Structure 1
């Protein structure tokens, strides 16, 4: 024969129950049977992005052939899974490939249409060394084969819409991703399957949270394959933690260590201590065996329940009379209620932990994938949001108003009250140059997701040309950066949960504001390569200096409201009404006071003492030296980077020179005493 040599008889497998009873998908099975009951062009192809269960649609079609939900044009049909890889890979020679394939077509035509041929990965058939299309073509035209394809949409439009004859030989059935609730229903059927295998239980809140958080976060793989990945991987982690016991291992190491100690000593007391620890070890071991026996009985009774369900389906196919009522009314409710009695018994007895996969397990598995704070406000990030003013003032002294505004913005977003097409929050930082624009940016990226490195800083001062705009969106096809990628859009597509930091957007060309109009309108910024860039998870922050002299000269005896309205008017003179129209909340910075400069110096002393204690020195400072640093590092035009370069040039250059001179000794208290113009270090 040929058919047993190359194909996989799926109806025999579904008759042996080795498949998945996939719930739903009723319209796609209907449209596949609409195609398969035609006269010519009997060839549906199942098209969708991978993971959506096109193989499962074919297997569910086979299960409906076996049970008999099909019309009277498919009953008794066999479904055979041709393996396109299993015909190419023997052909060394001229015409041994076509030998096999003509053998397959003669045996299927001997069956006389009684065999629905199934071909998975149909885009292997076309380019496989003329080969396989130009023999199947006279059979696919006359309907004497019954091919069912299964392919990704990209391989469809690449390997078939090219070759138009084999395009019209087939027929599309567009398969869409399932919904969230359909994903939940699918996973409920698959829970009822999977708890036979991993010997555990699954609580349906973990199922719905798994589906929702997988749809929220995993943006490469698609439903339901990613949800099944999460559920199965958590089931395997719990199958580990059945036999992971740690306390028995600690007690065994303790008793063998005290055994070696007592055997070396042969005052004693250790016969008594070892007897107590052996008694505790035996009790924990017997409790462990009791838990194992409980889980074994629960698994066996769950397996007998599922075999009873399979047997009552056997009675639904065959048609025994008393067997139906007997199996149902006896076997289903009593086995379910003592399955729940075993469930509450395991809830009583599992001290040595879980057999029920909770949502925290899903959080641990998805955190091992990516690392998001996946779950909700867990009173650690939530109290962080309740002290988000304090959390931002942990690193950024001063500028209370913008801290409050950004805190309110993220408090709106994490509660789900943002308009979910816009990005998380637009910001127009104003005011004096170099106070903590970038420090608030770093602190925001820090206490948003990870750290200061989950950002993209873009100097907008460099973009002053038309081809600069074509750079930062991406060059259109047939041109240059279309080879070598866009600028902004690639930086977003690498870091999808990030912060975009612009720098002096007023120094940019007067048209990049229109790209920002698209950004702050809807957060899709279609690049040069024609694929969308999704800003709905990010935070766009823009910095400027359009009223730095205006704010520094009028901060005295003017409140926050008049300052905001005045700088709104001035920015309206500079910018356009559309651009400031799309902004969520323009904040206004104020100039710095000398106590804030002293606080910046304090934080620099904190980080410098940390670095030099990692180096190995114990250094103290007089506050007079702090006052000299504060007076030598502020100006109305530059701000606190004068303090930074003053700290660098007056500490980091001379004191490290004194260290490298073999002068200073690690461990000594090093008081940074003052000079007339400098700071001297002593060894005391």
Structure 2
């Protein structure tokens, strides 16, 4: 066994020393492997499967069954040897060295007569000793494999099986593929129960059953880039390591939820009293930055509360909203406020401008170019951004400025919570919040009566007419199937005169915050605030004339005073008013 041990590892010997992890619930695959191994000819099973499933675990379980003697019929006390192709190729710089080593190994296997070879990553067997291209490992092994000698077990992924192993049809012919499927949730729970003992022994901690169940469920639901048996074990191992570095301890479901939340960013951790209180008053927090628009704030708070209470649909995004309203009313401001509330910073928003999505082919920016075309390797822009941050807010600004056919791609987002890029990958939108802003039907905000002669005058609030016109315009613009998937459509009421004072206060607070960097400060009287509110009401254009007025009435004077050196750091400019009617004008005074 000296030459055989020089180029391989005895798996049965390792299994006799309990150096292999236990295998749970793979009876069918092991039985099929044994059944294939007993054939008269071409008894060479290969396990092809996705990376993560127990392809090597099946072979380890077969070795353990051989050690335990459970295996019946011909396979009695057989020795299973994992072949190492690296050792065979090492050195052998001269002609006839790798071939000599392989022939010696084959002769040793034939002489002993009770050796079963295992070749992990079988796709590497196509090119082994092709220094120029001719006699390699596959060409040497073909006759014995075909004639029924040299029982061999291989393992390969589907991509590697298709790309490499199928380029040599003669070699692929001599193997019987076996499908290893990803285990279901109960099977994963059983596997976790089996490996709990080993992981507790290694990590010197204790794991509860609830921890295993939570790890399995959360890994299955939230982490979608890998496969179930591995990604569930990863959470347990990470929790064990995190608990170990803190120094018997205890591992529970809360720690697993925290680990997954910090790994992926999705807030699945356990609710706290402070966080619950903050969520219950989310409307006040949103109103700390946006004045008015009660309906939209209430809808957003309701959606967030549903998401955080574990009552949202697990197959659809957290919320879908259509913010329909006039110009300068606070739609983008509300979106930024929500982004700041959720993540702590307003620049974490994913903003997409539909002003530039006018051409119908620009939809290629959403998911990328098809195969064989320029830009195919860079797959998708929206999909790439959402994939890195599964929990985020997606904003479609000015949807009426884009081609109507662009929004068809959202049909699978709002209803199924998924989007497939041109490379075949699937990105899940089940943890995002979709907002689409528009100004449809908010054009003719005037004429509180009806054209032609009327007798009663049929008075109606402007809000009701706006709501009806927005509903009609939305029904006219988008298809019925698109509007049937939107969770909420909210209309932003036009800004009132009272709100202008609070908006002025917020703008002046922002100006003071910016100015305080240079050791300064600004103070206003109620008269100045009232004058500012009166001067820039402009109910049609919103609060943009307010910014323009504040910019060209207060910023310019302070800038001129700073340039002239009138005020120095440590001064607090106080602003009052003078005159009456059209003679009302601001006056500035220094302080300290």
Which category of TM-score, normalised to the shorter sequence, fits these structures? 0.7 to 0.9
2:66 counterpart of 1:61: no
Does the CA contact (< 8 Å) of 1:44 and 1:147 recur in 2?
Answer: yes
Cα distance in 2, alignment partners of residues 190 and 653 from structure 1: 71
Which segment drifts farther, 603-612 or 44-53? 603-612
Which segment drifts farther, 39-48 or 216-225? 216-225
**Could you tell me which residue of structure 2 aligns to residue 506 of structure 1?**
400
Does the CA contact (< 8 Å) of 2:52 and 2:229 recur in 1?
Answer: yes
Cα distance in 2, alignment partners of residues 537 and 61 from structure 1: 41
Cα distance in 2, alignment partners of residues 528 and 198 from structure 1: 43
Deviation of 1:663 (Å):
4.2
Change beyond 3 A, Cα 1:617–1:219: farther
Deviation of 1:449 (Å):
4.6
TM-score when normalising by structure 2 = 0.88
Change beyond 3 A, Cα 1:198–1:475: closer
Residue by residue over 1:533-592, the C-alpha shift from the partner in whole angstroms, topping out at 9 and shown as x without a partner, is: 322222221111112135676699528666534421232233332322222221111011
2:124 counterpart of 1:216: no
Note the aligned Cα RMSD (angstroms). Answer: 2.8
Deviation of 1:64 (Å):
0.8
2:462 counterpart of 1:462: no
Cα distance in 1, alignment partners of residues 30 and 547 from structure 2: 69
2:138 counterpart of 1:133: yes
**Could you tell me which residue of structure 1 aligns to residue 533 of structure 2?**
630
Which segment drifts farther, 617-626 or 24-33? 617-626
Deviation of 1:367 (Å):
4.6
Cα distance in 1, alignment partners of residues 472 and 436 from structure 2: 18
Residue by residue over 1:33-74, the C-alpha shift from the partner in whole angstroms, topping out at 9 and shown as x without a partner, is: 222222222222222222322222211111111112222121
Task: Give the 5 Å matches for 1:262-277.
Answer: none
Question: Which protein is richer in helix relative to its size?
Answer: 1
2:25 counterpart of 1:122: no
TM-score when normalising by structure 1 = 0.77
Residue by residue over 1:115-174, the C-alpha shift from the partner in whole angstroms, topping out at 9 and shown as x without a partner, is: 121111222222445432222222222231222222222222211133322222222222
**Could you tell me which residue of structure 2 aligns to residue 595 of structure 1?**
498
Extract unaligned runs of 5+ from structure 1.
243-353
**Could you tell me which residue of structure 2 aligns to residue 5 of structure 1?**
6
Deviation of 1:515 (Å):
2.4
2:582 counterpart of 1:577: no
Cα distance in 2, alignment partners of residues 513 and 418 from structure 1: 24
Does the CA contact (< 8 Å) of 2:495 and 2:539 recur in 1?
Answer: no
**Could you tell me which residue of structure 2 aligns to residue 361 of structure 1?**
255
Cα distance in 1, alignment partners of residues 589 and 100 from structure 2: 91
2:145 counterpart of 1:237: no
**Could you tell me which residue of structure 2 aligns to residue 617 of structure 1?**
520
Residue by residue over 1:606-654, the C-alpha shift from the partner in whole angstroms, topping out at 9 and shown as x without a partner, is: 3443344444334333333333443454534432233334444444555
In structure 1, the residue corresponding to 2:82 is in which secondary structure? Answer: strand
Does the CA contact (< 8 Å) of 1:624 and 1:674 recur in 2?
Answer: yes
Deviation of 1:7 (Å):
0.8
**Could you tell me which residue of structure 1 aligns to residue 19 of structure 2?**
18
**Could you tell me which residue of structure 1 aligns to residue 508 of structure 2?**
605
Task: Give the 5 Å matches for 1:89-488.
Answer: 89-112=90-113, 114-128=114-128, 129=130, 130=134, 131-242=136-247, 355-488=249-382
What is the total number of aligned residue pairs between the two structures? 572
Change beyond 3 A, Cα 1:234–1:527: closer
Does the CA contact (< 8 Å) of 1:618 and 1:666 recur in 2?
Answer: no
Change beyond 3 A, Cα 1:58–1:504: same
**Could you tell me which residue of structure 2 aligns to residue 542 of structure 1?**
436
Residue by residue over 1:630-682, the C-alpha shift from the partner in whole angstroms, topping out at 9 and shown as x without a partner, is: 34545344322333344444445553554465543333433244575456352
**Could you tell me which residue of structure 1 aligns to residue 384 of structure 2?**
490
Does the CA contact (< 8 Å) of 1:431 and 1:551 recur in 2?
Answer: no
Deviation of 1:202 (Å):
1.8
Change beyond 3 A, Cα 1:364–1:421: closer
Does the CA contact (< 8 Å) of 1:234 and 1:357 recur in 2?
Answer: yes
In structure 1, the residue corresponding to 2:183 is in which secondary structure? Answer: coil
In structure 1, the residue corresponding to 2:177 is in which secondary structure? Answer: strand
**Could you tell me which residue of structure 2 aligns to residue 680 of structure 1?**
588
Cα distance in 2, alignment partners of residues 552 and 421 from structure 1: 43
Residue by residue over 1:152-211, the C-alpha shift from the partner in whole angstroms, topping out at 9 and shown as x without a partner, is: 222222111333222222222222222222222222222222333333222222222222
**Could you tell me which residue of structure 1 aligns to residue 452 of structure 2?**
none
Cα distance in 2, alignment partners of residues 679 and 95 from structure 1: 99
Does the CA contact (< 8 Å) of 1:203 and 1:358 recur in 2?
Answer: yes
Change beyond 3 A, Cα 1:569–1:99: same
Cα distance in 1, alignment partners of residues 290 and 347 from structure 2: 17
Cα distance in 2, alignment partners of residues 210 and 679 from structure 1: 66
Does the CA contact (< 8 Å) of 1:673 and 1:682 recur in 2?
Answer: no
